[PDB]
Design a protein around this ligand. Sequence first.
Ligand SMILES: [Mg+2]
Ligand SMILES: [Zn+2]
Lengths: 253, 1340, 51, 369
Amino acid sequence: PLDGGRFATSDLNDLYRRVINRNNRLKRLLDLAAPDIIVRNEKRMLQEAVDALLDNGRRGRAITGSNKRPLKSLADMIKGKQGRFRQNLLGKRVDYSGRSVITVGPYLRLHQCGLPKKMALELFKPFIYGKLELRGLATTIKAAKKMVEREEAVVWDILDEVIREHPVLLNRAPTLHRLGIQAFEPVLIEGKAIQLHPLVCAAYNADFDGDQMAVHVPLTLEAQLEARALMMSTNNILSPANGEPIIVPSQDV
Amino acid sequence: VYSYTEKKRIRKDFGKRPQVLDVPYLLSIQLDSFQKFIEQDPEGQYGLEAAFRSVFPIQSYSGNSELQYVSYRLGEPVFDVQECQIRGVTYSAPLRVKLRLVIYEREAPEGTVKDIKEQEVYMGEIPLMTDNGTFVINGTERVIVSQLHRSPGVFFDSDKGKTHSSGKVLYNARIIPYRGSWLDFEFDPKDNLFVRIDRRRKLPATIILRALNYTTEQILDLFFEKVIFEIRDNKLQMELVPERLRGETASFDIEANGKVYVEKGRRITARHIRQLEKDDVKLIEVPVEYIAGKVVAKDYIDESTGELICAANMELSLDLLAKLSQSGHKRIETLFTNDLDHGPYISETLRVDPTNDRLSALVEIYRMMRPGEPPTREAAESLFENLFFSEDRYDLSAVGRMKFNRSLLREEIEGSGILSKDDIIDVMKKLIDIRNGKGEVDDIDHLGNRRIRSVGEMAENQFRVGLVRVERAVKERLSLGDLDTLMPQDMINAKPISAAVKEFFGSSQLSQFMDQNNPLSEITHKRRISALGPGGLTRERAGFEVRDVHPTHYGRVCPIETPEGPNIGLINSLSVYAQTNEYGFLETPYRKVTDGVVTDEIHYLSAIEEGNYVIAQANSNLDEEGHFVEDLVTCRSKGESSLFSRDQVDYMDVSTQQVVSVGASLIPFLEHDDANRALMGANMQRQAVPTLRADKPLVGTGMERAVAVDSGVTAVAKRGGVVQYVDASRIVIKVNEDEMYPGEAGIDIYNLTKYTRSNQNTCINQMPCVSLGEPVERGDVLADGPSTDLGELALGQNMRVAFMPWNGYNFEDSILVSERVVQEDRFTTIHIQELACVSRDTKLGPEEITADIPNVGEAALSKLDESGIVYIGAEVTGGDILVGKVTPKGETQLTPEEKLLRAIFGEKASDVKDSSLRVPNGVSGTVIDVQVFTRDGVEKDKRALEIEEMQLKQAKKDLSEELQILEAGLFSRIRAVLVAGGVEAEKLDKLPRDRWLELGLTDEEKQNQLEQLAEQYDELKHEFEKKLEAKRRKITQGDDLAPGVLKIVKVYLAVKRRIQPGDKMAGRHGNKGVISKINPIEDMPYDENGTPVDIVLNPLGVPSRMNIGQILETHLGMAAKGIGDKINAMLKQQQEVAKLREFIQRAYDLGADVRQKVDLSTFSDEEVMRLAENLRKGMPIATPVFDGAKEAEIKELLKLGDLPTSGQIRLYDGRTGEQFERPVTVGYMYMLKLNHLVDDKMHARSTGSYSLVTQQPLGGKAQFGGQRFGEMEVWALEAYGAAYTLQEMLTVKSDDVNGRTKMYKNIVDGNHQMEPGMPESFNVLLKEIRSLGINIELED
Amino acid sequence: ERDGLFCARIFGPVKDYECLCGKYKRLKHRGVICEKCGVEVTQTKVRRERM
Amino acid sequence: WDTIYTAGTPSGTSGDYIDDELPVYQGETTQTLQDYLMWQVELTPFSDTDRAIATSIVDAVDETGYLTVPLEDILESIGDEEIDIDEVEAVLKRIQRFDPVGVAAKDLRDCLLIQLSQFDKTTPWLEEARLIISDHLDLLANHDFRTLMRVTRLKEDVLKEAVNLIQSLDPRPGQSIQTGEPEYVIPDVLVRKHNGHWTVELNSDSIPRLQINQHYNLQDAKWLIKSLESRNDTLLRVSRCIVEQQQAFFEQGEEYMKPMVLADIAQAVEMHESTISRVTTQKYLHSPRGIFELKYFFSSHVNTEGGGEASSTAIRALVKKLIAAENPAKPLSDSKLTSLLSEQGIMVARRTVAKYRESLSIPPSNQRK
Ligand SMILES: [Mg+2]
Ligand SMILES: [Zn+2]
């Protein structure tokens, strides 16, 4: 769609239109009994149009559009680094996630992280709705929606109740080994930056000069138990590449 | 002798080498190029003249009529720069061209002048450049970046030994024009020359020669040396040239006069050649075997039969020699070949040549250019004539011709833009010579082979590109009759030129939004060189050797300032003194050295010229008469450096900062930093944000004033005078009569810029730095722009810092900040934002901006005025209404329910819907400005009327000021003349001006002079009335908008942001970090006087990074602050001016033979007291980049302030009162606030909108998108073994729709369990695969 | 258009339970094929899975 | 010279479009009123039958939030014979309290009562407003205030407070959910006054970049190039003829448009009537009076006693002008209108005047006092 309530055709539609036009012209010529030197030319052009539709540029030369660039065929949709397999089926964007700048917290314990409470309020919203309806504060879903919108004084107590023993996953990119994702218990803080335990930075290859991290929420009971038993930072003191410790002091310590 | 703006506060300089050449104007590269583009030219070498004369005259096919060009002109712009920026239009001027049409009669000799008609025609608009080298396109400032491309000419290259598996090197030679096609000559692995055009199919080399009027005999004559055969009736007694025998072994008995100098089986040596040359050996007896395989030169035919014996390019044989012996042939010609030299390549290619004559070669060329197309003679010959030899289709330019001739060693620089036979022949000969080891290949990264192209040249090229289309249209139109009334006005169209110019200026690769964080960002952007763009390289297929520091970059391109990442090495910065040739090659200045005496003559040398000399360094010590000191000096010559004697030197560098850019020249103690950290600091320095107050560095390099003044952000006095009026928003200067033009009131009015948005949505704000009644000179600073302090660049703040570890809060580049820093708003910034509401017109009626919105409460409409526009000064948050607008819903069927609704709730609520403008969610601020634009014909509202009243008052103010000055002068003259007639002194003084107007005198010339003066007074009044009327007319004029658009309203909001944990801070030495904590003031370390520190930095970041400049800067900042503290202590307990000036003179006299001389005896006591008041927060210091301050001088300055010489003091713990066990380094450092605020980084999401095809969450913060969970995160989860977490990621959180809804319902229900399904993207994949005719399906 | 690349007779309705001409609407006509326009009365998501 | 704009909205983009490859368009999802309603339906403790009834009910809600079919239609659409109508009524009552309150109402009285049922009992004039809405809601529509006062047995002040409370409610609760953004139209031909006469010119917002790909096929596109030229030529000619024939509509507004038909323009421009009907449809012109579709200038006619013809749009404008200035104490019936237009030479009927009044959406004479 464009401005003014008008639409522009995409690449697949263009290729389909070209194929249909060639097919109609060939059918009309064949029914009209034209000389062979013309029906053969139409047949060749129809073959070229179909070949362009199926795989554009593989044979001959790629047909371009208004932007002097080749059109996208079906094979282009299927394959490549921008195809379905690698862009949608092997990795994808997800809900219940955020990101922010990381700072240092020297007071934390090895199983703890520091999470801003605005991020936590946004990430744990259906849990807050459920807890609000459970204890009679809200009778309907819309009442809880309004209460969370207003940020009343009781929703912060609810938020402290829901995050009490619920782990979160912290991830820093690029993920080079499996220690690029780790599970922590959140401690609600003010400010807008995520606090990170000093002893794990070496595992993340992270430093506090502008790095950012993403945070994900596990939902079901199996995911929470997997976070507590497989991915928590207290289970990852030894490297998997060799047998040496990775959570080790450095620099100031 | 210091200027007024410099005498207020003088920066103490530690440099020791005198300056012989001042820093040039830093924006010359843009202004010169556009001035070349726009100015009139007597010849047609540059600009619009060269483009016009490249196309015109344009004549029809029949020759009956011709269109010709005479002159062009540019009118005055409609609006000013500020008006264009405010309104949102393009600052440009109209182009007028005087064309003429001539008619030629038929049946007449040549062209008879039946009629010539000349007319001026409108060609379009041309954007103009402002005083600071920028363009205002659609109201936003833009920069066009210069490009570093390959020069035209001829270039010889070779493959490095890769194109073949044998390791043999293959050479090639390319011809590169400005316009036209490419011509490549290349060697084959079989030593066969080949010719390629436009990278097309490889063709035999001799096809080009045969296309030209050339024959095989002529070819062999050109490319080979002859050998003469005389058969003197005895074994073909041969003539020999001794040097031809080198590298060969005798194959027979070589004798002269019966002595065999070289016998069979003996190799020919140099001494044998000496013997032959001494004896003049000519007659050589050789057998037939010596002529068994030699190639015949020309064609020979028997005189008896007359038939052809042997064709050209034929190797002889015994039978052929026997046949030609009886044919009466005594003189024969052969070719000469060897291996070390004179190798056979043309003959073998002729052997491979399939063509025979010119027509065959042209047909072959036509087949190559056009595949399968049946060619003829005419098409082929026309195509080959037009390919390289037509002025309209092939241009080599003037620089291309110069380089072409200089490569082939020709004495002429001038020439034509087309090729010829001689040029191609010479190129082939040069390639052959290089093949035979008699030449050298080029270096395509040498800065003598790379040219700079600026804005004017690009604009000229685009204008010519448009002119060709206009010419085609004219030629198509001119081929008819009806000429008895035609005029050139109906002959050309503005669109084909104006469209091209607009496209180039607004949507090119090298046209970019100006970087506007601070003045340094703008200066750096305007001096940038790019290797990308049209006609340049690409980020991926560029190479590895083009991203490297070539030795010829010395003094022309900064080796330190380049963007790290993908574009490293492809984006460069200019050096401080670098210029360009008249051809576009960078050159740099040097001082000529003659007779061992370094003089003051400056010569600008380019990379080609520089390599032939011996050039000394700027570190070299000189005597007072210019002579050197040591018999050995360090010099550069032929790309290397070594020691040379005092007499072998030719030149010398002008400065020690000649090799760096502007950004790198602002880093103090650069020579003590590693290059990586210097690069990082130079990049970081230009993304700092201006704060509420400026703060001069207090440790600088002396380059701050140049950057402050040459950036254009300040207000600079155009003429000298006195400050007649000073105010927070305007300045009025009373000009000296020595500079006033005749017949004017001498006043200059400067209107300062107050709280204006920049491209990065920050504040631009000017403040006066002068006071009422003080004198100013030309070029002094009157107002300070953003990040400027009394005319110096001030990007950050001076912080008191300590280096020590503090409980893990500065672990891994974290920063601990005091609460007193926050309390004083030292790093607080202002951010401004613009929003717009457009009242349009649609099919169902016009939209209306009004305050009567049908279904909103009285509280929501509380801040809207009577016109539905928010008040100035209102505080707004998310969801508040800024402009109230309604849109017509249309008409319905009018069922009884709708009629009942109309009856009850009113008819307005049934006709319109609410479509107002609201503050975006999560945005606050204060409304500081509203601008309303109304289309003509429509009526103005109250808001627009008030705005127009304000603007009219503002204009009337200046008009009244000038009129008042002129009226006062005229009245003074009138009264002076009136007294001379005999009028009373007191009576005239008490008589008012109206009474001065009406008075009588005698019948002398006094009455006539008074009448003349009164008439002049009336004329002055009329003139100023006319000026005011015109200004009012322009102010109150209606506006022309886009079709349909009726009204436009713009609202500006302003907010203040404070420092907080997560914000990024940096210094000038590559030391960046993030704030981790804000500490209460009584927890900070304090010294013995109870003074706390502002910032604590980790000392473990210094030794591994090797940026030692920050430690020295800290020490010197401590010393400067100590000097300032002594001055402040003297000032507080009021002491005599003598003591103040004595101490300040002692402070300025410090140092080991510095070049700065400050004398306080020529200062008045007022000046001394003002200077002391400006130095009471610390004395600023300058240390040049490679001519800075030593440790001894820093220690002396520490001793002057009664401070420890080691720079380390005793600190105490604020929480316990206990002394730290070791001394700590405490000082002052210049910190910056970078534009990486955590307010713009934090983002979170639970559920939102999804894509339509993939049904997956969108991306980005501005779309409330999700985080990507790519392949590597999947691998990590697989390595852990968390299968359920991965299944949650893949299905119920991204694109399983029913699973999404059921998971949300279960979570709200208190049941944490999922029921996964199939992702939608897999179904899409199945459909896409089945659209390819492949049956893929699930089963069982 | 009819018999085009976006035909509603072939690929389904453009709105939930509404045919193209507008004679049949709402959930009580589900599965009905309108005779005037030839469009089925069903969900509009079948345009994602009909070839 | 073409007029250059003296003001404009600076373009939203602030980037350098450096990337040479960008993905294909996909679009986003939107939340309409029914999406929000279904989202609330799912999170409510219904049953299977209740959820099916709720789905069928939400299917019938329109853009304004009003139910569009009777409950019998929903009960039939369920398709199960055990279900009665009271269950449907209960599910509808539960749905009507979703956000926004009053949505899915049968008629205005029901919506107003639903909204009033939510206010706390301590609101002062609650019972009076409830009585007014429940019993006598059309006497308020007639702005009577005296017969309503004679029936409600109340003083003036209580009635005024009740009316103010009633008019503070929301008659269209479902318009709060704004998923739409106001779309506009782009005029194709612009009409401006040159030398005192109106002349037309094509809009320069189109794409006139005539280019070919000679690097490598374009023969078919060469025909489209001139097809575009033919389209521009026919549009320009038809619009020029329309403006030339209607020189007086722009100068003096309506009441002066001529009664033209497709055949006149077809004869003028030498093209078939079908081509004229095709060009002048969904194509607009911009004038200092507004944006008008080209079809707007074709109209019917009625006989004029003077011997000419009067366009129907002129008669509609005259009816509007006469009714706008009628007697406030006693308005004008169409019998009066046909008399006033008779003396001017316009020979129209009475039912035709009534039809014109209906098309203008003007209440009858008795309702205009
Ligand atoms: Mg980092
Ligand atoms: Zn239908």
